[PDB]
Chain length 169, copies 2
């Protein structure tokens, strides 16, 4: 079974509207991702194996991590009800191409510990990503890293754990 | 590292109150378990490997499955807020011993699909289980199965999926 980019799938799906598409990510209060729709594979090229052990920050466009941070703070204050992002969220596909999304956030609050224990995000793409359309491919040698370097990922992840470990008021 | 029953751990934890204990299970809307506190191992003897692919019904005391069923129906109508069980919930440890609990239920409702997508249960034990105290052990040959037979597990699991697949009113 071949895996193919959303652009490529158009040739054999001539009536579909591949620019019209939403997908969900989920992660726990360790920041560890526990879910991404498989339907997102033609859009980001990211496999469950790519993501085992990592947070959203493994593929968020680096200067957009503040969108994520503020979403967790806004969720703590809404007690998990739907919050809007402060700006578009851009995600980096496996091949380095950039997928701009509009993202809404939801959170599950454990009623006994009163802490957030699941964060759910619904991403609505604005288009197919800019760059080469074959997100399934490997990125080209000599591309700048467009995600956070490990030390900064750990720095922002540390703060998100602290936010989620605080009892919801 | 040895794994030991809660009764056994008393000898080297002379000030602890092992009869005072609560633990959480979690499962998704396929009924598939995704979580059980590791601290429950001295109480039930059940490992993550015992549970990969199974629902709560793999270790609920068989005539108590109605407690679970009604909890899912009561959660659908509460929209995920804390519901009480209609009766005690008894769980079957790995060695066949029976652990009676008082259980409260919580559920996460996806705000976009409006369906339950996580069910969380907080189990408060009433005592150490009746039967041999070494829940870590294998059950004795020639014991009656005190959980649902596979055909009935699949029958009750089918209904729980149907309950959870219905949009919360």
């Amino acid at each position: 079974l071949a895996l193919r980019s959303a652009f490529s799938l158009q040739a054999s799906h001539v009536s579909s509207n591949f620019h019209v598409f939403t997908f969900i990510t989920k992660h726990s209060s360790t920041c560890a991702l526990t879910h991404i729709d498989y339907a997102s594979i033609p859009y980001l090229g990211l496999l469950p194996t790519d993501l085992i052990g990592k947070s959203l920050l493994a593929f968020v466009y680096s200067p957009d991590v503040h969108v994520v941070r503020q979403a967790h703070i806004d969720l703590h204050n809404s007690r998990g009800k739907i919050v809007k992002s402060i700006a578009d969220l851009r995600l980096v596909a496996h091949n380095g191409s950039i997928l701009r999304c509009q993202t809404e956030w939801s959170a599950y609050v454990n009623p006994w510990t009163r802490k957030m224990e699941l964060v759910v995000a619904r991403h609505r793409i604005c288009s197919l990503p800019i760059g080469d359309s074959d997100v399934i491919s490997s990125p080209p040698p000599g591309i700048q890293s467009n995600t956070l370097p490990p030390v900064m990922a750990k720095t922002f992840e540390d703060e998100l754990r602290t936010i989620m470990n605080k009892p919801v008021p």
